[PDB]
A paper describes a structure:
In this study, we report the identification of an aldo-keto reductase with 2-keto-l-gulonate reductase (Vv2KGR) from grapevine. Vv2KGR is able to catalyze the reversible reduction of 2KLG to IA, with NADPH as the preferred cofactor. Comparative structural analyses showed that Vv2KGR has a typical 2KDH fold and shares the highest structural similarity with plant hydroxyl pyruvate reductase (HPR). The observation that Vv2KGR is able to reduce 2KLG efficiently using NADPH as the preferred coenzyme supports its biological role in TA biosynthesis from Asc.
The ligand-free Vv2KGR was crystallized in the primitive monoclinic space group P21. The structure was solved to a resolution of 1.58 Å by the molecular replacement method. Twinning analyses showed that the apo-Vv2KGR crystal was pseudo-merohedrally twinned. Despite exhaustive co-crystallization and soaking attempts, no sufficient electron density could be observed for NADPH and 2KLG in the electron density map. The determined Vv2KGR structure has four subunits (chain A–D) in the asymmetric unit, which share high structural similarity. Each subunit is composed of 15 α-helices and 12 β-sheets, which are arranged in a larger coenzyme-binding domain (CBD) and a smaller substrate-binding domain (SBD). Subunits of Vv2KGR demonstrate no significant angular changes between domains (∼2° between chain A and D), which were calculated by the DynDom program, suggesting a stable catalytic site. In the asymmetric unit, chain A forms extensive interactions with chain D, whereas chain B and chain C are positioned more closely with their respective crystallographic symmetry mates. This observation indicated that Vv2KGR may function as a biological dimer. For the four subunits A, B, C, and D in the asymmetric unit, the buried solvent-accessible surface area (SASA) was calculated to be 2443 and 2428 Å2 for A-D and B-C interfaces, respectively, whereas the SASA for A-B, A-C, D-B, and D-C ranges from 235 to 458 Å2.
Residue numbers in the entry: 2 to 313
The structure:
Amino acid sequence: ESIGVLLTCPMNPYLEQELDKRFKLFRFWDFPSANDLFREHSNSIRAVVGNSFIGADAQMIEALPKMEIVSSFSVGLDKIDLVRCKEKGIRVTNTPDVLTEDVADLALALILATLRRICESDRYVRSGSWKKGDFKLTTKFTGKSVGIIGLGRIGSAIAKRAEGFSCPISYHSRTEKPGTNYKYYPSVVELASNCQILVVACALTPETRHIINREVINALGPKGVVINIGRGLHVDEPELVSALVEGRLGGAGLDVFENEPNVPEELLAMDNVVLLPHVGSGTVETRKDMADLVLGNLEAHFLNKPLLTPVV
């Protein structure tokens, strides 16, 4: 029913419209600052709907003492104080599985767009330069070694697609995953040294922050490409730009950045990089599935029914 729900940012028009219809919706951006909401409706909010941009941090959790559930429009939880949520009896839900296919599809697209210079080729035709001569030769994808940081649902989905291109697959992190034929590497530097396409597909934790640093980038080398579909903090972003400027890294296919929607100016002029505005899950089909899952978790919670996709 008309229960107080806080929407952190304009995630999705259909989700926002249903929240306004089923619940008592508070739009976080209708308040000049966060304290304008906290001072006026501290106890009015029983649910928070966030995403990868604004979630539920320690300050927000403590400023809303009546909060019962965090329903995230995301698979990632790096914007939610999960441990504090468990301490205060707050449920948290996300949207697993429903965006695996689209995010894996975007990783494979960035690999092809970087290796085959498709976005550069498109600018080549539309600028009229094809009348002068053939476009430069590019780099073959089929058969190239793909190393995946994180063999979860999305990482395993990327590997399945690369196998159709006859790609050797290796992976890294935690403990060796059972039931895979991919090559396990106990370190990222050894994974990067033995692959030409390095895919970030892990969760953002203090452990995985800046997991692609100067040392891993130097191990990747000028014949390698970084593919980041995870979080911008997975990569030491000033080091990635520096290595691309100096030729220590071949290219980069980047969907996420440190301070979105800001993208470093140096990357804008490079032909060996492909830059997308965080479109991993941004399809009509997936965003509808994510929206219906967030609504399904809120409904089940406030009806005292078992949640659909709980994390804690």
